[PDB]
Structures are given as C-alpha cells and as structure tokens.
Design a protein around this ligand. Structure first.
Ligand SMILES: N#C[C@H](c1ccc(Br)cc1)N1CCNCC1
Lengths: 300, 237
C-alpha cells in the first residue's frame, strides 16, 4: 500500500481519490493520502471551493514512482510532482503518518468497484492519450478537447483518443456502403481491433478511461468517446462472445457508479435506447439493461 | 443546412445542384395469393434526379431484377438510389459535378452521404419543401420509358422542354411544380386540362404540349383552380 503525501493545503478544496472524495478546509493540516492499493491505476482530483469551474486531476500508478502534491500559488492549482530521492521521500512520508495527518484510502474488502472500473486501464496507454512525456502521471481537466473535437485547438493539451467516425472512409469499404454502415463489424473487428487496438483489452481500456474522464471531470470529449465505442460494438452484428460478456460487465459497473443526479447529462438517450433496444446486441447486455431499466427508466 | 422558402432563389444561381427524389424507385402492386394471403409484385421504378436550373433530368430506370432475392426492399431502395446518384456524379466531368445535392426525403441523407464520402466538398442537403416530384410518373412519356424498360437504363430529358427560351429558370421551375402538384392532387382532371384541345400537340422531343405564352397562362390558372378545388372537395370548404 502506497502514499501520495501533500506539502500542504492552502486553499479550500474538495479532493477525490478514485471514486471517493472529501473536503479540506483552507490551511487545514492535511498531508495526503495513505494506504492506496497497489496494482491499479488511480486518479486524484480536485475542485476548488471558490471556483467549481474546472475539475482537474492526475492519473497515476504508484509502482511507477514516488508522487506527491504541492499547491502552486502562481498557477493556482494542486500540482502532482515526482520525488526522485527515494530516501528523502520515505523520510517525509513516515513523519506525516506518525503524526496522522493523512486520510486513509477507504477500501471496503468486499468492494471490487475500482477494479471493475479500471480492469483494462493501463498507465502506459493513458500516457499515449494524454501526451506529456516528461511526467509519469497524466493531467486531465474538464475543458480539454479531443483530437477529433479540434478536427471539428492546442494539440499539446488534447486528449488523443482513437478517432471513431461511422461516416468516414475508414469505416466504410468501397462497395459495401450499405452493408458496412448498417453492420459495423468490419470497422470493429478489422479496422479497430486488429488494425489499431491489436486486442479487445486495449479497446476496453480506452473505453473505460473515457468514461472515468467523463464522470470525474465533466469532459464532454470523453463522454462522446465512451458512447461511440459502445455504439460501435452494439452496432456490429459479429462480436466475439467474450467481448459481449465483458462489455456487459464493464457497462454494468459504470452505470452502477454514475452519480444519480448526473445521469441526465452523462447518459446519451439515443445511444442507449439504440444499443439496448434496437441494435444487433440488444439481447446481449442483460446486466447492463437490468440496471439501466431499474435505475434510469426515464431515459428509456 | 436545409432548403426552404427563405433560401429559395438559391436553386437558380450558378452553383450546379441537383434534386434527388427516390419516391418512385421501389414500386409494388399488392394482391391476394391463391391461399388468400397478400403478396407484392414489384414494377419498374426510377430515380428522379433534376438540375432545377437547366431542367436536365437524369432518369435512372430501376428494373425489377435489381430486387430479386433481396430483403428489406424499402431500405435497399434508398441505398440503391444513393449508389446510382454517386455513379452519375462520378461519370460526369469535374466541372459538371454538382456542388450540392438536395434530397426530397430525409431518409436519403445518410445513404447518400456515405456513398459520396469521396466527394467531401459536395454538400448533401434536405429540404422543408413539399415538392411534388412523385407525380413524375404521371408524365406519360416518362412512365412509358420506365414501364417498357427490360434492363437498367439511364434516360436523359429536359423537363422544361424549350421553356427557357422564353422564361427564367425560376418561372420554369414554378410552372413545373404547379403542373406536378395538380397531377398529384387529381391526375385525371390535370391531364384533361393539358390535352382537352387537340390542336395543341406535344412535340416528339418534348414532354408537355406546345403552348403559347397566352395559352400557358390559361393553363396555369386552370391548374390553380383545380388545386384549390380538390382542396375543398377534400376538406369541405
Ligand atoms: N451540461 C452539460 C452538457 C455536458 C457536460 C458534460 C458532459 Br461529461 C456531458 C454533457 N453539455 C452542455 C452543452 N455543451 C457542454 C456540455
């Protein structure tokens, strides 16, 4: 179990660590988060009390280095940093825990929620979507645009998700216009899975990272990416049985975790009604359809 | 975006454009079977593709053989329309290719956009107008070529005959829609109006009779009366 210490907390802020969150008051004696489970990616995120505009946060993996948070009063935010001096780091962390000014990552032992939301998410792939190679953690915020959003403006601060476009030459083979547009199996299995993602775990991992970006920072681009990846599967007549079964688990836990009050904006009515009730795969997402009908019957 | 009464003169500027109407592509007769069930029998159809500025009509005849052993024909028909339109565009020299294609029904937009992905600079557009292009199979010479065809076939016409020699493309277009609207609302009455006078003939290379300016005004008035009339007969007014 690992630790992300904080130098201090000079401004009042709501702090999130994965699906958990807590308030820190201005200059409260807060010095970070302990007992973070090793083996998963994590995200630590922030919303200032004074300006709820711009949620922001860092994706990270404690196996990849010693990371800490320090407020920057010039740039006005809590910044993730890496300590290369491993000795100095252990030294600082032990003092703060002895003085007990750290919150403990609050993992209930029956709870596999975080795992199931990040099963396929790999820090190496995150860093390819969020390009900033001098750091081993990745910054995201609410206003970052995707590579396709700029196609339709700063390329350095973009989310480089895999562009999916159902009305693109990539998606449509000359001579199968009707066939490939009504049954996207070619685009799913050959273009994206075999061509771009190589396997279904990488696809799913981008799918999961889009959803988390969408829910944790209200990143529209991520929401669009998450819905497109679902829709491409649901609209493909020919999908491996094992991807369908896993898709149903993935979405189930995503639907389960979503804030009830945010559902009206984070769930696209057209995509879900199509995926659950019209698409080739309308019969194939049993868990996902049961939770959506019992929790969000309005949207349908 | 879409095409309505507010950007109407756009049809007649010098940007090449075509209307596409798919209503007559897939046509059937419905009949009882020996066992007392109902079956359809397809009959030949046509894509109605029109340059509203020149009157050039690219009538692609849809032969019933193109449906043999196909399922979900009403859907295929939209994709077969798109494919024939896209083929037509590709057959034309670049400087004759349309800058826009306007579809009379919105269900054509996606089939056409997908077929025209090679032509990203051709705008595919819908329209809010209720255009009477479906009545095109009420033009005798057009219905005749369709019904006689024994194989796929493209036939070129000018749907304004020689009108542009005397009137503008706006007026010519307005005349055509008034004619086609009248044919759609009461075909018999419409045709009786156009042909009651044996002395006014239809030239071999034309679709409509050879009216004088004065005669066209009379005719145009009579089609307006017919369309207002049938609106009373229909609604009781
Ligand atoms: N309110 C809201 C929604 C929204 C916001 C965040 C996410 Br994630 C999904 C949809 N959008 C309003 C108009 N464009 C901006 C965003």
């Amino acid at each position: 179990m690992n630790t992300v210490p904080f130098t201090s907390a000079p401004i009042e802020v709501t702090i999130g660590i994965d699906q958990y969150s807590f308030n820190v008051k201005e200059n409260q004696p807060f010095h970070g988060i302990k007992d973070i489970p090793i083996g998963h990616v994590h995200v630590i995120h922030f919303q200032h009390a004074d300006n709820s505009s711009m949620r922001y946060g860092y994706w990270f993996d404690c196996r990849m280095g010693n990371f800490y948070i320090q407020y920057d009063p010039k740039d006005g935010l809590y910044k993730m940093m890496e300590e290369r001096d491993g000795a100095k780091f252990e030294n600082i962390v032990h003092n703060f825990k002895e003085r007990q000014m750290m919150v403990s990552y609050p993992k209930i032992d029956e709870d596999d929620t975080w795992y199931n939301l990040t099963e396929f998410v790999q820090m190496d792939k995150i860093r390819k979507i969020v390009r900033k190679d001098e750091n081993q953690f990745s910054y995201v915020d609410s206003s970052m645009t995707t590579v396709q959003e700029n196609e339709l403006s700063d390329p350095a601060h973009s989310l480089n998700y895999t562009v999916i476009n159902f009305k693109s030459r990539e998606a449509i083979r000359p001579g199968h216009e009707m066939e490939d547009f009504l049954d996207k199996s070619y685009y799913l299995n050959t273009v994206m899975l075999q061509g771009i993602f190589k396997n279904s775990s990488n696809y799913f991992g981008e799918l999961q990272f889009a959803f988390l970006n969408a829910m944790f920072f209200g990143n529209y681009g991520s929401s669009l990416q998450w819905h497109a990846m679902i829709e491409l599967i649901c609209s493909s007549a020919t999908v491996p049985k094992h991807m369908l079964d896993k898709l149903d688990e993935i979405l189930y836990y995503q639907i389960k975790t979503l804030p009830e009050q945010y559902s009206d904006i984070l769930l696209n009515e057209r995509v879900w009604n199509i995926c659950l009730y019209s698409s080739f795969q309308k019969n194939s997402l049993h868990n996902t359809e049961k939770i959506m009908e019992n929790k969000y019957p309005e949207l349908l | 975006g879409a095409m309505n009464s507010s950007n109407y003169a756009e049809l007649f500027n010098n940007d090449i454009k075509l209307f596409v109407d798919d209503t007559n592509v897939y046509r059937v007769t419905v009949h009882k079977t020996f066992e007392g069930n109902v079956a359809t029998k397809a009959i030949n159809g046509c894509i109605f593709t029109l340059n509203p500025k020149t009157g050039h009509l690219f009538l692609k005849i849809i032969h019933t053989s193109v449906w043999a052993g196909q399922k979900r024909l009403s859907q295929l028909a939209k994709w077969k329309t798109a494919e024939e339109v896209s083929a037509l565009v590709r057959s034309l020299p670049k400087e004759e290719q349309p800058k826009q294609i306007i579809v009379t029904r919105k269900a054509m937009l996606d089939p056409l956009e997908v077929h025209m992905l090679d032509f990203p600079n051709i705008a595919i557009r819908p329209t809010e107008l209720r255009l009477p292009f479906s009545a095109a199979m009420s033009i005798d010479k057009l219905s005749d070529v369709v019904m006689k065809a024994t194989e796929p076939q493209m036939v070129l016409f000018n749907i304004y005959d020689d009108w542009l020699d005397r009137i503008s493309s706006y007026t010519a277009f307005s005349r055509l829609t008034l004619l086609l609207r009248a044919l759609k609302t009461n075909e018999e009455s419409a045709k009786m109006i156009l042909l009651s006078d044996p002395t006014i003939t239809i030239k071999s290379y034309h679709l409509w009779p050879s009216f004088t300016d004065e005669q066209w005004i009379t005719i145009e008035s009579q089609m307006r009366d017919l369309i207002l009339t049938e609106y009373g007969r229909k609604y009781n007014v």
